């Protein structure tokens, strides 16, 4: 354990360091369907998959 003689919570404080940003969305600007379906596969070969996360986050 590297925390025995090296104590710094503010470096390891994730609870109080979360924040919420703000945006405004409007109907006038069109949605980018190029992003949604341009990256979509058109053939079986191009299919890409997201693997299951093996472990949940741990400090180590």
């Amino acid at each position: 354990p590297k925390l025995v003689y090296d104590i710094k919570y503010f470096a390891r404080d994730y609870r109080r360091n979360n924040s919420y940003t703000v945006r405004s969305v409007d109907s006038k600007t069109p949605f980018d369907y190029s992003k949604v379906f341009g990256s979509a596969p058109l053939k079986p070969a191009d299919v890409k998959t997201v693997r299951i996360p093996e472990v949940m986050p741990h400090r180590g």
Binding site: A11, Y14, N18, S19, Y20, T21, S24, Y33
Partner: protein, 134 residues
């Protein structure tokens, strides 16, 4: 997945699989490629009622075009299933389910909003991002 039946059956037959997992309950029809093409074209005809400069209509047009393309290059009906991550039967039922809510969307007309419409969006920033690095 693993079959829970002691009886030995072949799951590469691509019909014994469908009989085992109960796709027949979803639709008694075989669900060929031509049926999918017809369903997509009927959805395209249906969404004509929605105004031309409506984001919903553009979305349905884009999705139908993408799926008609995926039907285009892929001559195998199973290949369409692999690309679209679905059985052809449920892909066909999908367009009918879309057809069902068109009357409800034409009664309230959600696309009508004023030219100053603004929907505030609040986004969450994780501390792990900032603490580890910037």
């Amino acid at each position: 997945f693993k079959a829970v039946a002691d009886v030995e059956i072949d799951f590469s037959n691509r019909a014994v699989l469908k009989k085992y997992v109960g796709v027949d309950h979803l639709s008694k029809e075989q669900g060929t490629k031509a049926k999918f093409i017809v369903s997509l074209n009927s959805l395209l005809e249906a969404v004509k009622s929605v105004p031309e400069t409506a984001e919903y209509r553009k979305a349905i047009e884009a999705t139908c075009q993408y799926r008609l393309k995926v039907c285009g290059e892929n001559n195998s009906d199973a290949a369409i299933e692999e690309v679209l991550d679905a059985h052809l039967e449920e892909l066909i039922a999908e367009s009918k389910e879309e057809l069902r809510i068109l009357p409800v969307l034409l009664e309230s007309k959600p696309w009508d909003v004023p030219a100053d419409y603004s929907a505030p969006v609040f986004d969450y920033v994780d501390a792990s991002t900032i603490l580890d690095k910037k």
